[PDB]
Amino acid sequence: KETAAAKFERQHMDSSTSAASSSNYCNQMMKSRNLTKDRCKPVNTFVHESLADVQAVCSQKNVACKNGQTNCYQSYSTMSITDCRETGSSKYPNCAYKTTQANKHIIVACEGNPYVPVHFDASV
Ligand SMILES: Nc1ccn([C@@H]2O[C@H](CO)[C@@H](OP(=O)(O)O)[C@H]2O)c(=O)n1
């Protein structure tokens, strides 16, 4: 019965690789972090930075969330990210994903004590 913090870590942290090497990256990770479970999640980002590097973003540039909440934060620097997106071919439980590897800034929603990332709002 996962915390919000632990859930974000399971969804979004990939500190083990520096980048998506393969086109297959999304397919394996989405399945592997248990995200194709009941359904094919349409979009999920994975962050190839340290967990402390991503926790620090909660203290960077404060922006609106796309929900117009005001507890989101843009990283000052770019970061290695893998964007995973369902193709139109895709058919649950046979989820298929297009892998895009980029260096982008991330925007996260933080909460709690400690104030850590609980949502992945977007990358820019
Ligand atoms: N750019 C984006 C946009 C959405 N998402 C995923 O899609 C969801 C929004 O519907 C996110 O939920 P969380 O912010 O709870 O992680 C997230 O896990 C993402 O991972 N990257």
From Swiss-Prot:
Its EC number is 4.6.1.18. Substrate binds at K7, R10, K41, P42, V43, N44, T45, K66, R85. Belongs to the pancreatic ribonuclease family. Endonuclease that catalyzes the cleavage of RNA on the 3' side of pyrimidine nucleotides. Acts on single-stranded and double-stranded RNA. GO terms for biological process: defense response to Gram-positive bacterium. One of its GO terms (cellular component) is extracellular region. Keywords: Disulfide bond, Endonuclease, Glycation, Glycoprotein, Hydrolase, Lyase, Nuclease, Secreted, Signal. This is Ribonuclease pancreatic. It catalyses: an [RNA] containing cytidine + H2O = an [RNA]-3'-cytidine-3'-phosphate + a 5'-hydroxy-ribonucleotide-3'-[RNA]; an [RNA] containing uridine + H2O = an [RNA]-3'-uridine-3'-phosphate + a 5'-hydroxy-ribonucleotide-3'-[RNA]. One of its GO terms (molecular function) is lyase activity. Glycans are attached at K1, K7, N34, K37, K41. Interacts with and forms tight 1:1 complexes with RNH1. Dimerization of two such complexes may occur. Interaction with RNH1 inhibits this protein. Monomer. It is found in: Secreted. It is an enzyme of class 4 (lyase). Disulfide bonds join C26-C84, C40-C95, C58-C110, C65-C72. The gene is RNASE1. The active site is at H12 (proton acceptor), H119 (proton donor). Pancreas.
